[PDB]
Amino acid sequence: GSSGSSGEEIFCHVYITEHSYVSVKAKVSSIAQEILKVVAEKIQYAEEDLALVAITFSGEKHELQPNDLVISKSLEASGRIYVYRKDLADTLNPFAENSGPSSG
């Protein structure tokens, strides 16, 4: 329980849409869940109902585990993770917007 922030300070980029994301401050070896649990909130959803979708440059959707690292980068030039809503279909499919107006 609890975890003070010190050293190994980094952030996990989680792209919601095409030009949308959420900055998450996790460890350098923090699991995806550690981000999903954050993003989920940053998006106002259920991490358990969400999932980290790892896509490549070419353009291919990919899903991992909630225990899978987020900021590992083993061997992949560039990369951007995403988050999809768990539907009733094997598929995940991205989002649309789901949000209201802000500041004016």
Swiss-Prot record:
Tissue: Widely expressed with highest levels in brain.
Subcellular location field: Nucleus
Function comment: Guanine nucleotide exchange factor (GEF) for RAP1A, RAP2A and MRAS/M-Ras-GTP. Its association with MRAS inhibits Rap1 activation.
Protein's name in the database: Rap guanine nucleotide exchange factor 5
Source organism of this protein record: Homo sapiens
Gene (name only): RAPGEF5
Residues of the full protein shown: 241 to 331 of 580
